[PDB]
């Protein structure tokens, strides 16, 4: 197949440096530019600059002047983007694309490489249970939920009853509080199951090799 193959996900503190690898194969490397694209949370897809295989030299869009450096090692077909002195604002996913000299489009995109910048150290989460505080059948249904709070880095995996409960499960996306992650999940079951029968959430944080099981006990 013909593609640009990029490096793996980086986790860096501030003031570090990252060198993303964009290795081309299958196509004639010299006759296409390699373009770079920054994707930031919520922010737009922002064209960062370009690299000319022909002549070597590289063109930077103002925003990415100087700290971002476009390298290249042609024999080896790899292209490079390096960020030095990572500010916390560089957390994004970087794409390298094959730029075409005639129709000026970007047709072969790389899989992307995510830089996550943070001064947080690995931390286990705190799995709190959240049982009703006594509400009634809305219409014969109950909803419990766990609150996985305070972790780093992402991700955390949450299962109810070890995979048995899929439907009604709504694991909400991790959000941030002072460098650390806080995330929640909710499961909804018929009034008959709880408390006749046990519901539990299994919270695993591979980053710190911790699995926690908090059994939702009534209130």
């Amino acid at each position: 197949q013909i593609q640009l193959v990029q490096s793996g996900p980086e986790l860096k503190k501030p003031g570090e440096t990252v060198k993303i690898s964009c290795k081309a194969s299958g196509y004639a490397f010299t006759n296409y530019g390699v373009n770079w694209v920054k994707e930031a949370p919520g922010k737009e897809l922002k064209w960062m600059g370009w690299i000319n295989i022909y002549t070597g030299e590289p063109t930077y869009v103002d925003d990415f002047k100087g700290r971002f450096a476009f390298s290249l090692e042609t024999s080896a077909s790899t292209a490079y983007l390096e960020i030095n002195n990572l500010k916390n604002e560089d957390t994004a996913t970087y794409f390298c694309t094959r730029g075409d000299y005639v129709n000026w489009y970007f047709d072969v995109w790389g899989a992307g490489t995510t830089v996550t910048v943070s001064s947080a150290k690995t931390t286990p989460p705190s799995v709190y249970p959240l049982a009703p505080g006594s509400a009634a059948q809305t219409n014969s249904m109950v909803t419990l939920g766990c609150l996985v709070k305070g972790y780093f880095p992402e991700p955390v995996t949450v299962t109810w009853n070890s995979g048995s409960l899929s439907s009604g499960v709504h694991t909400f996306p991790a959000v941030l509080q002072s460098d650390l992650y806080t995330l929640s999940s909710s499961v909804t079951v018929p009034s008959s199951p709880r408390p006749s029968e046990t519901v539990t959430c299994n919270v695993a944080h591979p980053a710190s090799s911790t699995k926690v099981d908090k059994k939702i006990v009534p209130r």
Partner: protein
């Protein structure tokens, strides 16, 4: 920078229909060379963008003739004849005529369903957290459509704006609805200063608010 502004942000297409995305430029995309370089990408969930069509109206290799393009000078319009599940995801129009190629907007194709109101649940701080001095109140606004919902946290009646944290789930694969949690976290002392904590959900589908409370 030619700023592309396209809307709507979310297009609740009804699978099978013709859908139209439109996009507009803050400049003419007409080059000295006498051509327009407006291109169209499609990015399916958690993935790389794909070239869909180039120079306003040319289908890139692969794009079935269900996709059609159009426009000139400054307004453009990508059009899908009869939508198909395979082609849902966000859509981006980038132009490569001026420097720089700006990407703007982002129109996501989502599914359309009967309006749903939210199964709003509310939960008080579990012993465990109180014992560590934290206090997290959790309101689960569940299983509803349309996607927008306005949440209010009244603590003793007086609204709170800070200490909040919302998180949504994009359209549920098998029931076309959305869900969101609102997590008002405050210190235990701020907490036991008062009784009464209530969640407020003002949504399309309802006459008056949806309120939920527990009295500490």
């Amino acid at each position: 920078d030619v700023v592309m502004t396209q809307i709507p942000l979310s297009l609740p297409v009804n699978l099978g229909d013709q859908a139209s995305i439109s996009c507009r430029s803050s400049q003419s995309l007409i080059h000295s060379n006498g051509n327009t370089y407006l291109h169209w990408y499609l990015q399916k969930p958690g993935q790389s963008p794909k070239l869909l069509m180039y120079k306003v109206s040319n289908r890139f290799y692969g794009v079935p003739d269900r996709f059609s393009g159009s426009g000139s000078g400054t307004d453009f319009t990508l059009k899908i004849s009869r939508v198909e599940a395979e082609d849902l995801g966000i859509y981006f129009c980038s132009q490569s005529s001026h420097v720089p190629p700006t990407f703007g907007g982002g129109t996501k194709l989502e599914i359309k369903r009967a309006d749903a109101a939210p199964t709003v649940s509310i939960f008080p701080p579990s012993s465990e957290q109180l014992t560590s001095g934290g206090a997290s109140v959790v309101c689960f606004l569940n299983n509803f459509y349309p996607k927008d919902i306005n949440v209010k946290w009244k603590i003793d009646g007086s609204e709170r704006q800070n200490g909040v944290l919302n998180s949504w789930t994009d359209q549920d694969s098998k029931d076309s609805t959305y869900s969101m949690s609102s997590t008002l976290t405050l210190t235990k002392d701020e907490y036991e200063r008062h009784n009464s904590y209530t969640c407020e959900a003002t949504h399309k589908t309802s006459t008056s608010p949806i309120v939920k409370s527990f009295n500490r």
